[PDB]
Amino acid sequence: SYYAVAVVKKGTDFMIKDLRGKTSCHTGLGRSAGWNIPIGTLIHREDIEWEGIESGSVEQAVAKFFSASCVPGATIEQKLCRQCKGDAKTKCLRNAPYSGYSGAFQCLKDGKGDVAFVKHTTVQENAPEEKDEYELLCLDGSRQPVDSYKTCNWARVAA
Numbered sequence: 254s255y256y257a258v259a260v261v262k263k264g265t266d267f268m269i270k271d272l273r274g275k276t277s278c279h280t281g282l283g284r285s286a287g288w289n290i291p292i293g294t295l296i297h298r299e300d301i302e303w304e305g306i307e308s309g310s311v312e313q314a315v316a317k318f319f320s321a322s323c324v325p326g327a328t329i330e331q332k333l334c335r336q337c338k339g340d341a342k343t344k345c346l347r348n349a350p351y352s353g354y355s356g357a358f359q360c361l362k363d364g365k366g367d368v369a370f371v372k373h374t375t376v377q378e379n380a381p382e383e384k385d386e387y388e389l390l391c392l393d394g395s396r397q398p399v400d401s402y403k404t405c406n407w408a409r410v411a412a
């Protein structure tokens with residue numbers, strides 16, 4: 254079991270209400286801290302209105318919602334692939350430089366994203382020497398520092 258956390262650089266000042274039109278980094282299409290929890294959360298405080306109905310387009314309603322994302326694994330929406338590092342043909346594959354926990358966070362570190370949707374051990378695991386350079390978006394419209402994820406997380410995820 255992990256916690257889903259939303260990780261941001263210190264010195265940006267956007268809160269959870271303020272996410273529309275930001276850029277984002279996800280581990281990949283369909284993963285738990287990655288597409289599932291933040292996108293469903295955003296859908297249920299009504300930030301992402303489900304744009305589709307020729308077609309349940311979740312990918313569309315999300316592309317409508319952030320400016321540009323990296324979401325390795327994305328099928329339909331070429332906005333979702335727009336911040337991804339790598340080659341033309343490769344960069345948005347389900348494994349690619351920006352795929353996964355480590356890659357979602359490297360997206361944000363690299364400046365390629367304003368937020369990374371990840372898990373509670375990602376910043377320590379990947380950059381223990383730069384943890385104070387980050388904080389976490391809480392659901393209550395505050396920030397807390399990276400250690401505070403028990404008190405600052407989008408959800409607790411099963412095994």
Ligand SMILES: [Fe+3]
Pocket residue numbers: 284285286
């Ligand atoms: Fe996961």
